[PDB]
A paper describes a structure:
In the Firmicute B. subtilis, the ytqI gene product was shown to be a major nanoRNA turnover enzyme, and was renamed NanoRNase A (NrnA). We show here that Bacillus NrnA is a bidirectional nuclease that can degrade RNA fragments from either the 3′ or the 5′ end. We have determined crystal structures of B. subtilis NrnA in its apo form, as well as complexed with substrates. These structures reveal a dynamic bi-lobed molecule with the DHH catalytic domain and the DHHA1 substrate binding domains connected through an extended linker.
In the crystals of NrnA H103A soaked with both MnCl2 and pAp, electron density corresponding to the full pAp ligand is not seen, presumably because the mutant still retains some residual activity. Instead, additional tetrahedral electron density outside M2 is clearly visible in all four chains when 2Fo-Fc and Fo-Fc electron density maps are contoured at 1.75 σ and 3.50 σ respectively. Strong 2Fo-Fc electron density (ranging from 9.0 σ to 6.5 σ) was seen at two positions in each active site for all four molecules in the asymmetric unit. This density was modeled as two Mn2+ ions present at full occupancy. Two bound Mn2+ ions at the NrnA active site are characteristic of DHH family active sites including those of inorganic PPase and RecJ, as well as NrnA homologs. Metal 2 (M2) also coordinates with aspartate carboxylates including of D24, as well as a histidine, H20, which is substituted by an Asp in the RecJ active site. A difference map contoured at 5.0 σ revealed the presence of an ordered water molecule between M1 and M2 that provides additional oxygen ligands to the metal ions and may be activated for nucleophilic attack of the incoming substrate. H104, the second histidine in the signature DHH motif, does not coordinate with M2 and is therefore accessible for interaction with the substrate’s phosphodiester backbone. We can take the product phosphate seen at the active site in our H103A:Mn:pAp structure, the 3′ nucleotide from the H103A:pAp structure, and the planar density outside F162 observed in the H103A:pAA*A to build a composite model of the pApA dinucleotide in the B. subtilis NrnA active site.
Numbering used by the authors: -6 to -1, 1 to 249, 251 to 257, 262 to 275, 278 to 280, 284 to 285, 299 to 302, 304 to 306, ...
Write the structure that this text describes.
């Protein structure tokens, strides 16, 4: 039909052929990972009870509530179909026995710089891999695929995870229309958002500190150092603090860096940032870019 309709049917055909299917995602998983890898796993469990389907990898603790993962022998990979989602690079795949199956399938929305797999479906126009999986489902409908409540919730969590609940510019028509269909399943989006957005008191306090102390140059320049005492004063990791860099986004008139000792993260509202050089788009403090 649509060169696309053909590609998706080929993945569906291949999935129907193999009795054992093992699914992976990228290390340091995020909602999209859990949405796609596990969204598909759930679709295949419901559609094909007679097969042996497994999702492998190391759990992220804040994401567990979504789904729990399987631990699998080396022997189970023999003759198995392996599907890997949301991972641009083979060296970032979680659980490296990914190419020891009979076949390997790449499903991804990042650029195809590492074109791995026997079968590949890689669209950079998708908002997320979870969205790609809903699409794959739609085509699988004709072929007897079933979406249950669990799977709906997974895919929906992955789409809101990669778009910042329809905030970022990777949101498309398809993203929103698909979201529409998903929320007709009876999972609580409210419970879901509460779980996704839940933040430990100590991190909140930290954010606070940051907000209280941010300063702005007349050219919209802003900077945040989270020195030594600070990370201990608040009892927060490097990982927890660095992850607050995107909380300054709405300050009126901001055009900032971020930082943090273990690290540099940078963000803009205009002036590209793939510039400031120190091997997406206080010496570094040449930032006031904002000048021009
Ligand atoms: Mn991801
Ligand atoms: Mn993704």
């Amino acid at each position: 039909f649509q060169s696309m309709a053909s590609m998706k049917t080929e993945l569906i055909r291949t999935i129907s052929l193999y009795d054992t299917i093992i699914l992976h995602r990228h290390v340091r998983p995020d909602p999209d990972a859990y949405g796609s890898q596990c969204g598909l796993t759930e679709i295949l469990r419901e559609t094909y009870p007679e097969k042996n389907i497994f999702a492998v990898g190391t759990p992220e603790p804040s994401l567990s509530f979504l789904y729990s993962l399987d631990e699998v022998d080396n022997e189970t990979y023999e003759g198995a179909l392996v599907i890997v989602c949301d991972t641009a690079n083979q060296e970032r795949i979680d659980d490296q026995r990914y190419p020891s199956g009979a076949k390997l399938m790449k499903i991804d929305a990042h650029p195809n710089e590492d074109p791995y797999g026997d079968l590949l479906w890689v669209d950079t126009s998708a908002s997320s891999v979870s969205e790609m999986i809903y699409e794959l489902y739609l085509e699988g409908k004709e072929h007897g695929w079933k979406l249950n409540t669990k799977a709906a919730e997974l895919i929906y969590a992955g789409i809101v995870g990669d778009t910042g609940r329809f905030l970022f510019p990777n949101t498309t028509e398809k993203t929103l229309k698909y979201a529409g269909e998903l929320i007709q399943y009876p999972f609580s989006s409210s419970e879901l958002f509460n779980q996704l957005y839940e933040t430990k008191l100590n991190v909140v306090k930290l954010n606070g500190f940051i907000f209280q102390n941010v300063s702005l140059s007349e050219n919209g320049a802003a900077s945040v150092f989270i020195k030594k005492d600070t990370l201990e004063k608040f009892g927060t990791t490097a990982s927890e603090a660095s992850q607050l860099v995107g909380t300054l986004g709405n300050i009126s008139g901001i055009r900032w860096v971020f930082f943090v000792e273990e690290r540099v993260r940078f963000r803009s509202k205009g002036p590209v940032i793939n510039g400031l050089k120190y091997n997406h788009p206080d010496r570094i403090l040449d930032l006031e870019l904002c000048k021009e």
